[PDB]
Enzyme design. Structure first.
Site, PDB file in Angstrom:
ATOM      1  N   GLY C  10       0.816  -1.202   0.000  1.00  0.00           N
ATOM      2  CA  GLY C  10       0.000   0.000   0.000  1.00  0.00           C
ATOM      3  C   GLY C  10       0.856   1.260   0.000  1.00  0.00           C
ATOM      4  O   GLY C  10       2.067   1.204   0.012  1.00  0.00           O
ATOM      5  N   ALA C  12       1.583   3.765   2.118  1.00  0.00           N
ATOM      6  CA  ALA C  12       2.487   4.066   3.208  1.00  0.00           C
ATOM      7  C   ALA C  12       3.646   3.091   3.199  1.00  0.00           C
ATOM      8  O   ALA C  12       4.782   3.535   3.304  1.00  0.00           O
ATOM      9  CB  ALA C  12       1.825   4.009   4.575  1.00  0.00           C
ATOM     10  N   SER C 140       0.469   0.494   6.253  1.00  0.00           N
ATOM     11  CA  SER C 140      -0.405   1.249   7.137  1.00  0.00           C
ATOM     12  C   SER C 140      -1.436   0.328   7.796  1.00  0.00           C
ATOM     13  O   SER C 140      -1.713  -0.760   7.329  1.00  0.00           O
ATOM     14  CB  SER C 140      -1.035   2.367   6.451  1.00  0.00           C
ATOM     15  OG  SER C 140      -1.962   1.937   5.464  1.00  0.00           O
ATOM     16  N   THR C 179      -6.640   9.892   6.070  1.00  0.00           N
ATOM     17  CA  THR C 179      -7.440  10.159   4.866  1.00  0.00           C
ATOM     18  C   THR C 179      -8.813   9.473   4.926  1.00  0.00           C
ATOM     19  O   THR C 179      -9.516   9.411   3.888  1.00  0.00           O
ATOM     20  CB  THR C 179      -6.642   9.715   3.627  1.00  0.00           C
ATOM     21  OG1 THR C 179      -5.682   8.694   3.909  1.00  0.00           O
ATOM     22  CG2 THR C 179      -5.786  10.831   3.043  1.00  0.00           C
ATOM     23  N   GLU C 254      16.105 -13.399  16.825  1.00  0.00           N
ATOM     24  CA  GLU C 254      16.684 -12.829  18.029  1.00  0.00           C
ATOM     25  C   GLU C 254      15.860 -11.602  18.420  1.00  0.00           C
ATOM     26  O   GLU C 254      15.770 -11.273  19.618  1.00  0.00           O
ATOM     27  CB  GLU C 254      18.166 -12.595  17.717  1.00  0.00           C
ATOM     28  CG  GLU C 254      19.164 -12.953  18.817  1.00  0.00           C
ATOM     29  CD  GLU C 254      20.469 -12.152  18.697  1.00  0.00           C
ATOM     30  OE1 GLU C 254      20.979 -12.254  17.523  1.00  0.00           O
ATOM     31  OE2 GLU C 254      20.927 -11.399  19.670  1.00  0.00           O
TER      32      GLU C 254
HETATM   33  N1  LIG Z   1       3.902   7.779   7.560  1.00  0.00           N
HETATM   34  C1  LIG Z   1       3.199   7.703   6.427  1.00  0.00           C
HETATM   35  N2  LIG Z   1       1.934   7.461   6.534  1.00  0.00           N
HETATM   36  C2  LIG Z   1       1.339   7.370   5.346  1.00  0.00           C
HETATM   37  C3  LIG Z   1       1.880   7.427   4.092  1.00  0.00           C
HETATM   38  N3  LIG Z   1       0.891   7.269   3.115  1.00  0.00           N
HETATM   39  C4  LIG Z   1      -0.187   7.036   3.818  1.00  0.00           C
HETATM   40  N4  LIG Z   1      -0.004   7.146   5.178  1.00  0.00           N
HETATM   41  C5  LIG Z   1      -0.967   6.849   6.229  1.00  0.00           C
HETATM   42  O1  LIG Z   1      -1.555   5.582   5.850  1.00  0.00           O
HETATM   43  C6  LIG Z   1      -2.977   5.673   6.092  1.00  0.00           C
HETATM   44  C7  LIG Z   1      -3.733   5.545   4.781  1.00  0.00           C
HETATM   45  O2  LIG Z   1      -3.406   4.247   4.219  1.00  0.00           O
HETATM   46  P1  LIG Z   1      -2.585   4.176   2.836  1.00  0.00           P
HETATM   47  O3  LIG Z   1      -1.381   3.337   2.964  1.00  0.00           O
HETATM   48  O4  LIG Z   1      -2.554   5.460   2.109  1.00  0.00           O
HETATM   49  O5  LIG Z   1      -3.619   3.221   2.021  1.00  0.00           O
HETATM   50  P2  LIG Z   1      -3.390   1.947   1.105  1.00  0.00           P
HETATM   51  O6  LIG Z   1      -2.630   0.930   1.842  1.00  0.00           O
HETATM   52  O7  LIG Z   1      -2.792   2.409  -0.184  1.00  0.00           O
HETATM   53  O8  LIG Z   1      -4.889   1.416   0.867  1.00  0.00           O
HETATM   54  P3  LIG Z   1      -6.060   1.919  -0.172  1.00  0.00           P
HETATM   55  O9  LIG Z   1      -5.570   3.143  -0.885  1.00  0.00           O
HETATM   56  O10 LIG Z   1      -7.338   2.098   0.597  1.00  0.00           O
HETATM   57  O11 LIG Z   1      -6.052   0.873  -1.257  1.00  0.00           O
HETATM   58  C8  LIG Z   1      -3.193   6.999   6.857  1.00  0.00           C
HETATM   59  O12 LIG Z   1      -3.187   6.847   8.275  1.00  0.00           O
HETATM   60  C9  LIG Z   1      -2.073   7.880   6.282  1.00  0.00           C
HETATM   61  O13 LIG Z   1      -1.790   9.130   6.896  1.00  0.00           O
HETATM   62  C10 LIG Z   1       3.266   7.649   3.976  1.00  0.00           C
HETATM   63  O14 LIG Z   1       3.946   7.748   2.940  1.00  0.00           O
HETATM   64  N5  LIG Z   1       3.853   7.768   5.229  1.00  0.00           N
END
Ligand SMILES: Nc1nc2c(ncn2[C@@H]2O[C@H](COP(=O)(O)OP(=O)(O)OP(=O)(O)O)[C@@H](O)[C@H]2O)c(=O)[nH]1
Ligand SMILES: */C1=C\C(=O)C/C(C)=C\C=C\C(=O)O[C@H]([C@H](O)NC(=O)/C=C\C=C\C)C/C(C)=C/[C@@H]2COC[C@H](C1)O2
Ligand SMILES: Nc1ncnc2c1ncn2[C@@H]1O[C@H](COP(=O)(O)OP(=O)(O)CP(=O)(O)O)[C@@H](O)[C@H]1O
Ligand SMILES: Nc1nc2c(ncn2[C@@H]2O[C@H](COP(=O)(O)OP(=O)(O)O)[C@@H](O)[C@H]2O)c(=O)[nH]1
Ligand SMILES: [Ca+2]
Ligand SMILES: [Ca+2]
Ligand SMILES: [Ca+2]
Ligand SMILES: [Cl-]
Ligand SMILES: [Mg+2]
Ligand SMILES: [Mg+2]
Ligand SMILES: [Mg+2]
Lengths: 57, 319, 434, 417
Positions: C10, C12, C140, C179, C254
């Site tokens: 995903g 994040a 995430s 989001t 570990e």
């Molecule tokens: N730290 C950080 N958090 C992120 C990032 N992108 C998204 N988030 C967090 O991840 C959550 C949203 O999930 P995402 O990973 O964007 O969603 P996904 O896994 O792509 O899932 P879908 O788009 O619903 O298919 C929120 O809490 C965001 O603020 C990133 O690059 N860094």
């Protein structure tokens, strides 16, 4: 200080201050897919009833 | 506009703070589970401290120090004193005490030393009450308690030969400033002391509600003992307050924390006939004498709340 | 030498992965084209950095990584960005339509259709390993893919690599950057389904990282790029033991042995210092003291009001044992550090002598010495209580439930996930409170 | 989650839709010939969402049961940008009659519309869904538009359906039968849309008259507002960003219960310019376009979109201030239910703007008003002959009134909870 290990890249040690199935997954996914298929069939049935009322009007 | 919630309906002190905050015109009371509050007037048990300080853009304050229970239960005070070097097993202003489970200090409960030494050997068993000079009575009774040396030589008020305790109200703000409200109260017995007349929790005879205020105790100390409240007693009270609160400060301070805490404590002291002050107890959730509510409650608002949330001294600062 | 495979799931997961691999290249002297002039064995080897990188005949060092996302725009940035030549297309997997912030969509509806492809691509990586130790899985909690696809993947990895360890780096949701209103649901559903399959999970609360970026890096409004640079430093501190020579945390097993004595309580708190703005050098005592400051933690919570089960200090830079020991002595007399009765009160310490690397034109200043502390404290359960309460508020009115049911999830999966979490909160409480 | 297909039906639907395409074409640097002549890469990054491809053609289907308004569209400013085959029209009109749109004249044309929907859908890489613009008070947008929605849902049941629906008011009215047509339409929307922006003509009127001081508003002035607001609420679909970036993600964040998908849109500024001013204006009832007072109910969910160069720090601050100030109007059982997005590109003529989308239980007021106006006539069976002469029976009206009163009760339930 116990277990002191040293190499050229660093060291590590310990300081002690005080002692004391594929098939079941497949099944769950397919049951969900079957539930999606059922709700979709219920919807197309309802739409078909609307088409029939349209023709009656 | 600041926002507050009220999660303890039986707090007389915080019901009055609540009333005062609203009359400023600059606070709104929210429903009790709305998370968007500046101030929590919290519940007595299982206050969800872990839900504080996670609201983007809200400075959040609560009226309890997490971890303060250590000072404010009988057994845990005893342990805190015995195990903290700055207080210690040999602390001079806290009566000899032992934690007794129905680890257990039964064996350590020194009773035999005193018996053998012909010394006064009266103890008091209590928890969160029996007075006796016999160990097995106290041990039997308990079957989490503390057994503590009972003060056989209390200072007695005249007229009426009678026992009292002193309640001091202390407020600790978010910066860990320690404020001692300048009005304390003596809760008297109105029965002559005989070694009812032993527990200070003819009623009403010598003073209204068996409450003597500082003006009259000071006058009494002057007339009968040629000294003052300040010198004879309050120096010690202030020493003890400070020693206790400075001891837990690393455990409970909210100084670098994502939420802030203040709290009101009631310290209970006994005075012996040599004018030595002994701590008996610390109350985490005190009430106030009727005539002192309005002054104290205003003071909480000025010092604990408006300090953090300015709008548009009754306290001695212990340094 | 035993390899580790990284899987990034995903948005994040992928974006954090890209920051980690960039930093890994900089720490090991690997260039954007994958060349590593310091590696004198062309075409293979069993150096420590080979846990994370394979080698081709031409001398390219290739991340042992897979990236998966259900829509293409994030992984397209990997395919065209600076480190594009590190990766081959088989490592990069995209669908066309994402999970719409819905665990059920990621897990059931779209997960069913891409899982086999993902497992094939991971198997191609597994087959080049002589002794695969296991997996590091980045995602995430809040996204539909990061939550729902990850939990499906973790289940199928337990089946196909039953003896292998799996570690997580998991991004816990924070409203200042989230989001989706339904993130608490997603977080609980995936934590419930993943808990038996993960041996160790490092949670990072976006709230904490955001605040560190604001307070210590003087960024008024942190972006994901800012957050991810910081996160990758902490990740790098954690994985350094696998990629450099050392005697501490040198395999994935570990991590469990040293940080997780009870399998369900497998969420260590990471605390990192110092974080200094790239617009006055801190001693060992200072940085070690800073590991007990809630403001430096990856999850805001109060360790003074729980109990420790384990604590590992991971230093990088100019640090010698004697200074570490003197600092531990100091801090013990000033701080509330209580271990559970059934564990030793002590620290495992690792020192890697190379200072932290910083990304050129990042926000982070170069320092002479840094530390990451991994402590397994019951205080981290505060974060589970926060999420569970949010879940409760919405679930009591069944808000948004129809979205999940409509993807073929049963409603009872909610209450089952929730019940699992209530037993987790209770586990932490029994270990942690007298 | 790339392409959206746009459908505009009947007079209102095509007049507002034409303006929408004019305004968003100007924002993306597309000229009336379909050529790109702009300055910034942001304009083209998500262009495919609304336009097929160096000419860009709106993914847009224009429907009416009479030719007049579509002739006007073709002659209008951006008229030549639409694909000629995408104009689908009959001759006979719908006479402001839902039954003619839905069951008789509309039924004869609907197949040819679906042919074009399919040709546009079939060259989508990954269709997200459909947006329809129409009125509920006439016959073609209302009756034929809801007929179209039902047929689209049958052929694309897993795609999102979004409407911009103009609701009639007695004060800005063409015919007396508008409440009947709106009531019949609303039961269709409840069943077959995922998201409906409820635009009350009286609200548009009162904004032009009371706030903008236009002493005699025309439909053209109402549509100018509407197209601006539609531009605002689609910003997230059309430009780069994190939040509500596709129709499904927006639905998942905005719709906690399937039938409660009727939103109140808002625009700021509307004055006859700072971040605090925008923020306060966007939450004021005078800036909202459904003629319901949000202080009379509770927000389930809100999306706030800011456009222009402004401090994102100050935007986060103001947004937090409003919610922490009037927290009584946000249901407490959806945590963090207000989401804020910020797009760099401002609308034409403004340095900054804000668009509001609220899912508020106060919207019930709009449905109750329609319900009362329906009943006042229906209790005497007034004007029904126009509908029964097209084959409908009184029972279909009884059922639509019941369905609308059920929607009203469902809002009430969550208002009190
Ligand atoms: N730290 C950080 N958090 C992120 C990032 N992108 C998204 N988030 C967090 O991840 C959550 C949203 O999930 P995402 O990973 O964007 O969603 P996904 O896994 O792509 O899932 P879908 O788009 O619903 O298919 C929120 O809490 C965001 O603020 C990133 O690059 N860094
Ligand atoms: C359509 C405009 C057009 O045909 C007439 C002209 C030339 C201007 C109309 C302006 C207008 O409607 O302005 C609205 C407000 O009255 N503006 C302000 O409140 C301005 C500043 C306030 C400071 C405190 C706002 C609107 C609805 C503007 C829209 C934006 O979208 C395009 C459209 C152009 O105007
Ligand atoms: N060691 C001691 N020696 C003498 N009297 C003692 C004593 N411990 C307790 N007392 C007496 O018993 C009273 C009640 O004791 P204690 O303070 O334990 O109960 P409590 O918890 O009800 C007080 P509060 O209402 O202030 O919390 C004291 O005020 C005092 O009169
Ligand atoms: N805002 C707006 N309302 C309009 C416009 N044209 C018609 N209406 C409204 O739309 C309704 C009449 O439906 P209309 O679209 O003319 O009929 P149709 O062609 O049969 O779909 C009434 O509520 C009118 O007030 C327009 O251009 N703008
Ligand atoms: Ca090599
Ligand atoms: Ca396992
Ligand atoms: Ca005909
Ligand atoms: Cl295996
Ligand atoms: Mg008490
Ligand atoms: Mg995604
Ligand atoms: Mg008309």
């Amino acid at each position: 200080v116990i277990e002191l290990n040293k190499c050229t890249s660093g060291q590590s040690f310990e300081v002690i201050l005080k002692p004391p199935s594929l098939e079941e997954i497949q099944k769950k996914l397919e049951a969900a897919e079957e539930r999606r298929k059922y709700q979709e069939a219920e919807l197309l049935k309802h739409l078909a009833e609307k088409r029939e009322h349209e023709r009656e009007v | 506009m600041y926002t507050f919630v009220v999660r303890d309906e039986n707090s007389s002190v915080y019901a009055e703070v609540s009333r005062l905050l609203l009359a400023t015109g600059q606070w709104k009371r929210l429903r009790k589970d709305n998370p968007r509050f500046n101030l929590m007037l919290g519940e007595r048990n299982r206050l969800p401290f872990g839900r504080l300080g996670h609201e983007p853009g809200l400075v959040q304050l609560v009226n309890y120090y997490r971890g303060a229970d250590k000072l404010c239960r009988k057994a845990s005070l005893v342990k805190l004193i015995k195990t903290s070097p700055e207080l210690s097993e040999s602390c001079t202003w806290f009566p000899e005490s032992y934690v007794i489970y129905p680890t257990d200090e039964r064996e350590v409960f020194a009773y035999n030393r005193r018996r053998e030494g012909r010394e006064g050997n009266v103890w008091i068993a209590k928890s969160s009450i029996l007075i006796s000079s016999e160990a097995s009575e106290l041990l039997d009774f308990i079957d989490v308690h503390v057994i503590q040396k009972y003060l056989e030589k209390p200072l007695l008020l005249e007229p009426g030969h009678r026992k009292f305790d002193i309640r001091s109200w202390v407020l600790v703000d978010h910066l860990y400033n320690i404020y001692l409200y300048r009005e304390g109260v003596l809760r008297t017995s109105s029965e002559p002391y005989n070694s009812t007349c032993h527990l200070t929790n003819n009623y009403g005879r010598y003073e209204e509600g068996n409450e003597m205020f500082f003006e009259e105790f000071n006058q009494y100390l002057m007339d009968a003992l040629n000294t003052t409240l300040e010198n004879s007693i309050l120096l010690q009270i202030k020493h003890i307050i400070r020693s206790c609160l400075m001891c837990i400060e690393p455990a409970i301070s909210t100084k670098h924390l994502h939420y802030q805490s203040f709290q009101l404590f009631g310290f209970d002291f006994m005075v012996d006939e040599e004018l030595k002050v002994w701590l008996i107890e610390v109350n985490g959730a005190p009430a106030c004498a009727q005539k002192l509510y309005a002054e104290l409650c205003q003071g909480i608002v000025d010092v604990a709340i408006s300090s953090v949330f300015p709008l548009a001294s009754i306290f001695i600062k212990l340094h | 030498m035993r390899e580790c495979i990284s899987i990034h799931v995903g948005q994040a997961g992928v974006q954090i992965g890209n920051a980690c691999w960039e930093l890994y290249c900089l720490e090991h002297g690997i260039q954007p084209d994958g060349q590593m002039p310091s590696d004198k064995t062309i075409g293979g080897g069993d150096d420590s950095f080979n846990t994370f990188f394979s080698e081709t005949g031409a001398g390219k060092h290739v991340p042992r990584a897979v990236f998966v996302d259900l829509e293409p725009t994030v992984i397209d940035e990997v395919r065209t960005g600076t480190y594009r030549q590190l990766f081959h297309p088989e490592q990069l997997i995209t669908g066309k339509e994402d999970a719409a912030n819905n665990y059920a969509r990621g897990h059931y509806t779209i997960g069913k259709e891409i899982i086999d492809l993902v497992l094939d691509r991971i198997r191609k990586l597994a087959d080049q390993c002589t002794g695969l130790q296991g997996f590091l899985v980045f995602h995430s909690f809040g996204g539909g893919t990061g939550s729902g696809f990850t939990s499906l993947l973790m289940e199928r990895l337990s089946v196909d690599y039953g003896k292998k360890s799996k570690l997580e780096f998991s991004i816990y949701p924070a409203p200042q950057v989230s989001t989706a209103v339904v993130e608490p649901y997603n977080s609980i559903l995936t934590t419930h389904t993943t808990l038996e399959h993960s041996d160790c999970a490092f949670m990072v609360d976006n709230e904490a990282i955001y605040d560190i970026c604001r307070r210590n890096l003087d960024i008024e409004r942190p972006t994901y790029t800012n957050l991810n640079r910081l996160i990758s430093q902490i990740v790098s501190s954690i994985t350094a033991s696998l990629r450099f020579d050392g005697a501490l945390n040198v395999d994935l097993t570990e991590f469990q042995t040293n940080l997780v004595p009870y399998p369900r309580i497998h969420f260590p708190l990471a605390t990192y210092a110092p974080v200094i703005s790239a617009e006055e050098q801190l001693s060992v005592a200072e940085i070690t003291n800073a590991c007990f400051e809630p403001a430096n933690q990856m999850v805001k919570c109060d360790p003074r009001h729980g109990k420790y089960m384990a604590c590992c200090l991971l230093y990088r830079g100019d640090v010698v044992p004697k200074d570490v020991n003197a600092a531990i002595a100091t801090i013990k007399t000033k701080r509330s550090i209580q271990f559970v009765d059934w564990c030793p009160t002590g620290f495992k310490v690792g020192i890697n002598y190379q200072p932290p690397t910083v990304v050129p034109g990042g926000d982070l200043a170069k320092v002479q010495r840094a530390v990451c502390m991994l402590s397994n404290t019951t205080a981290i359960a505060e974060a589970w209580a926060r999420l569970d309460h949010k879940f409760d508020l919405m679930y009591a009115k069944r808000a948004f439930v129809h979205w999940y049911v409509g993807e073929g999830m049963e409603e009872g999966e909610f209450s089952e996930a929730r019940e699992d979490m209530a037993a987790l909160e209770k586990d932490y409480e029994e270990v942690g409170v007298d | 989650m790339r392409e959206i297909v746009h459908i505009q039906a009947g007079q209102c639907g095509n007049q507002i839709g034409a303006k929408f395409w004019e305004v968003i074409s100007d924002e993306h640097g597309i000229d009336p010939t379909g050529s790109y002549h702009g300055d910034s890469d942001l304009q083209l990054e998500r262009i495919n969402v609304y336009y097929n491809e160096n000419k860009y053609v709106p993914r847009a289907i224009l429907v009416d049961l009479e030719p007049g308004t579509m002739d006007s569209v073709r002659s209008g400013p951006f008229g030549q940008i639409f694909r000629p085959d995408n104009f689908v029209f009959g001759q006979s009109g719908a006479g402001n009659n839902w039954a003619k749109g839905h069951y008789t004249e509309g039924a004869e044309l609907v197949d040819s519309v679906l042919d074009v929907v399919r040709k546009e859908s079939e060259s989508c890489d990954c269709l997200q869904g459909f947006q329809l613009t129409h009125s509920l008070g006439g016959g073609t947008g209302s009756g034929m538009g809801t007929l179209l929605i039902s047929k689209i849902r049958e052929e694309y049941p897993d795609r999102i359906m979004n409407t911009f629906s103009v609701m009639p008011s007695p004060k800005v009215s063409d015919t007396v039968v508008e409440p009947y047509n709106a009531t019949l339409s609303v039961h269709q929307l409840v069943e077959n849309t995922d998201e409906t922006y409820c635009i009350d003509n009286e609200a548009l009127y009162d904004i032009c008259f009371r706030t903008l001081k236009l002493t005699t508003p025309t439909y053209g002035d109402l549509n100018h507002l509407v197209s601006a607001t539609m531009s605002g609420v689609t910003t997230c679909l059309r430009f780069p960003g994190q939040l509500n970036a596709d129709l499904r993600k927006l639905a998942v964040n905005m719709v906690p219960f399937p039938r409660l998908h009727f939103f109140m849109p808002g625009f700021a500024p509307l004055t006859s310019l700072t971040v605090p001013e925008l923020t306060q204006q966007m939450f004021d009832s005078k800036n909202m376009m459904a003629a319901c007072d949000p202080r009379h109910g509770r927000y389930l969910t809100v999306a706030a979109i800011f456009r222009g160069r402004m401090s994102m720090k100050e935007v986060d601050e103001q947004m937090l201030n409003v919610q922490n100030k009037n927290s009584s109007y946000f249901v407490e059982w959806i945590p963090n239910n207000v989401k804020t997005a910020v797009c760099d590109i401002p609308p034409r003529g403004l340095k900054m703007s804000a668009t509001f989308i609220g899912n508020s239980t106060a919207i019930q007021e709009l449905f109750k008003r329609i319900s009362e106006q329906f009943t006042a006539m229906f209790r005497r069976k007034a004007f029904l002959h126009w509908y029964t002469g097209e084959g409908m029976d009184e029972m279909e009206f009884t059922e639509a009134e019941s369905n609308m009163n059920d929607l009203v009760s469902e809002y009430q339930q969550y208002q009190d909870a």
